[PDB]
Design an enzyme around this catalytic site. Structure first.
Site, mmCIF file in Angstrom:
data_model
loop_
_atom_site.group_PDB
_atom_site.id
_atom_site.type_symbol
_atom_site.label_atom_id
_atom_site.label_comp_id
_atom_site.label_asym_id
_atom_site.label_seq_id
_atom_site.Cartn_x
_atom_site.Cartn_y
_atom_site.Cartn_z
ATOM 1 N N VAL A 70 0.838 -1.195 0.000
ATOM 2 C CA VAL A 70 0.000 0.000 0.000
ATOM 3 C C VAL A 70 0.874 1.247 0.000
ATOM 4 C CG1 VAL A 70 -2.098 -0.973 1.026
ATOM 5 C CG2 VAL A 70 -0.263 -0.092 2.518
ATOM 6 N N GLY A 71 0.313 2.338 -0.518
ATOM 7 C CA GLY A 71 0.980 3.623 -0.487
ATOM 8 C C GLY A 71 1.981 3.807 -1.612
ATOM 9 N N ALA B 88 6.196 6.809 0.591
ATOM 10 C CA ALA B 88 6.673 8.047 1.204
ATOM 11 C C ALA B 88 7.146 7.835 2.635
ATOM 12 C CB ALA B 88 5.576 9.114 1.162
ATOM 13 N N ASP C 211 3.947 11.107 10.742
ATOM 14 C CA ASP C 211 5.322 11.525 10.385
ATOM 15 C C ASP C 211 6.274 11.713 11.574
ATOM 16 O OD1 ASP C 211 7.644 12.092 8.862
ATOM 17 O OD2 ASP C 211 6.791 13.829 7.851
ATOM 18 N N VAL D 54 5.743 -0.442 3.052
ATOM 19 C CA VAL D 54 4.544 -0.636 3.867
ATOM 20 C C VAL D 54 3.577 -1.596 3.177
ATOM 21 C CG1 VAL D 54 2.721 0.534 5.171
ATOM 22 C CG2 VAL D 54 4.880 1.724 4.716
ATOM 23 N N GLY E 154 8.062 4.660 3.807
ATOM 24 C CA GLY E 154 8.884 3.472 3.841
ATOM 25 C C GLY E 154 8.243 2.360 3.041
HETATM 26 O O1 LIG Z 1 5.346 8.355 10.881
HETATM 27 C C1 LIG Z 1 5.578 7.033 10.926
HETATM 28 O O2 LIG Z 1 6.646 6.661 11.456
HETATM 29 C C2 LIG Z 1 4.539 6.230 10.239
HETATM 30 C C3 LIG Z 1 3.580 6.784 9.479
HETATM 31 C C4 LIG Z 1 2.523 5.960 8.798
HETATM 32 C C5 LIG Z 1 3.070 4.922 7.799
HETATM 33 O O3 LIG Z 1 4.229 4.238 8.201
HETATM 34 C C6 LIG Z 1 4.274 3.842 9.523
HETATM 35 C C7 LIG Z 1 4.119 2.482 9.805
HETATM 36 C C8 LIG Z 1 4.197 2.060 11.128
HETATM 37 C C9 LIG Z 1 4.432 2.976 12.158
HETATM 38 C C10 LIG Z 1 4.582 4.334 11.866
HETATM 39 C C11 LIG Z 1 4.493 4.784 10.544
HETATM 40 MG MG LIG Z 2 8.163 14.708 6.569
#
Ligand SMILES: O=C(O)C1=CCCOc2ccccc21
Ligand SMILES: [Mg+2]
Ligand SMILES: [Cl-]
Ligand SMILES: [Cl-]
Ligand SMILES: [Cl-]
Ligand SMILES: [Cl-]
Ligand SMILES: [Cl-]
Ligand SMILES: [Cl-]
EC number: 2.7.11.24
Length: 343
Positions: A27-28, A31, A159, A35, A33
């Protein structure tokens, strides 16, 4: 007892996760990582599972991994992203190599409105920000894509613990700069949590008008748009710009008075206009704080001073500590094994 793990090929890599997580699917855009969405059979939630990319390849990456885990383990508030789980398939520190983080799956962000909608959305941002700031954390990157929103208008701030944004990411006609306070955009001075209130003002204006407030084509164009609205700096603020070169450039610009916000935000609730004037102040010392803004009359239908909590203390002394790769790795391992899930 350690759960049983199973393996699957995802995002060009082999993912190894506990049996509780089923139906994994990427998904995504990437941006935040690498995921995947999943269904968590223990809680019934749809979740986002992030597998960290090469977490301990350098001192900078190892410390960044520790920072992300520390921040996410601390944040426990309805309007802020929280950690549902963290895991590794490794059975010991010696074989520890990969870290996985689990949070609630959020469908949409603010990019994807009555005055009542604006009240509720900005109220929730400020409620979460009061909590973040009480822990002496500065967000630095509030913008619509970092605000998750559901069908019932409920909101969470995203974030935490990602890489600091690069100069190239901030160059040109780009949303990653349009919400930044001028003192951080131009490195005027040592900044503090007041930068985040500027960003909230930019977001609120955009919800009221449907248009970006300061859509600059570059850093200088954006500064010109800002100063036209809020006025050029006075002598008091000029003294506080500790950068000699930045101070000299500012004084090359013809002086301009602050504009009438009722003539810029035509038709808006007068209480919304008043709040915008208190957020969008050039001198950061004089901006309204999150705690003060929650008590402003614009939020009278939502404000409850007995339901706006603050955070437990957050020790970030590690940020000024110098350690080797394996020492950051061991600290991270300790934080994985000590995690206790929420109720
Ligand atoms: O700001 C972060 O670290 C995240 C944003 C949402 C998307 O990735 C994540 C997955 C798991 C834990 C946290 C995050
Ligand atoms: Mg940022
Ligand atoms: Cl399991
Ligand atoms: Cl591992
Ligand atoms: Cl955005
Ligand atoms: Cl940043
Ligand atoms: Cl002048
Ligand atoms: Cl702490």
């Amino acid at each position: 007892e350690r759960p049983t793990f199973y393996r699957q090929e995802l995002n060009k890599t082999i993912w190894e996760v506990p049996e509780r997580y089923q139906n994994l699917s990427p998904v995504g855009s990437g941006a935040y990582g690498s995921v995947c969405a999943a269904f968590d059979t223990k809680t019934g939630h749809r979740v986002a599972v992030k597998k960290l990319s090469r977490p301990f390849q350098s001192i900078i990456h190892a410390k960044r991994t520790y920072r992300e885990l520390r921040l996410l383990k601390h944040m426990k508030h309805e309007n802020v992203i929280g950690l549902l789980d963290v895991f590794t398939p490794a059975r010991s520190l010696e074989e520890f190599n990969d870290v996985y983080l689990v949070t609630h799956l959020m469908g949409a962000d603010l990019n994807n409105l009555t005055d009542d909608h604006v009240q509720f959305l900005i109220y929730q941002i400020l409620r979460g920000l009061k909590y973040i700031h009480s822990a002496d954390i500065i967000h630095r990157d509030l913008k619509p894509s970092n605000l998750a929103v559901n069908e019932d208008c409920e909101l969470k701030i995203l974030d935490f613990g990602l890489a600091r944004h690069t100069d190239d990411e901030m160059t040109g006609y780009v949303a990653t700069r349009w919400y930044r306070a001028p003192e951080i955009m131009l490195n005027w001075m040592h900044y503090n949590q007041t930068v985040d209130i500027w960003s909230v003002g930019c977001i609120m204006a955009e919800l009221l008008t449907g248009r970006t407030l300061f859509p600059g084509t570059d850093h200088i164009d954006q500064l010109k748009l800002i100063l036209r609205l809020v006025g050029t700096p006075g002598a008091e603020l000029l003294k506080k710009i500790s950068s000699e070169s930045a101070r000299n450039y500012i004084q090359s610009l013809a002086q301009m008075p602050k504009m009438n916000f009722a003539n810029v935000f035509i038709g808006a609730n007068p209480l919304a206009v008043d709040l915008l004037e208190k957020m969008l102040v050039l001198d950061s010392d004089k901006r309204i704080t999150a705690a003060q803004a929650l008590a402003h009359a614009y939020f009278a239908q939502y404000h409850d001073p007995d339901d706006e909590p603050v955070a437990d203390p957050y020790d970030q002394s590690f940020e000024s500590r110098d350690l080797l790769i394996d020492e950051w790795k061991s600290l991270t391992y300790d934080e994985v094994i000590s995690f206790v899930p929420p109720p």
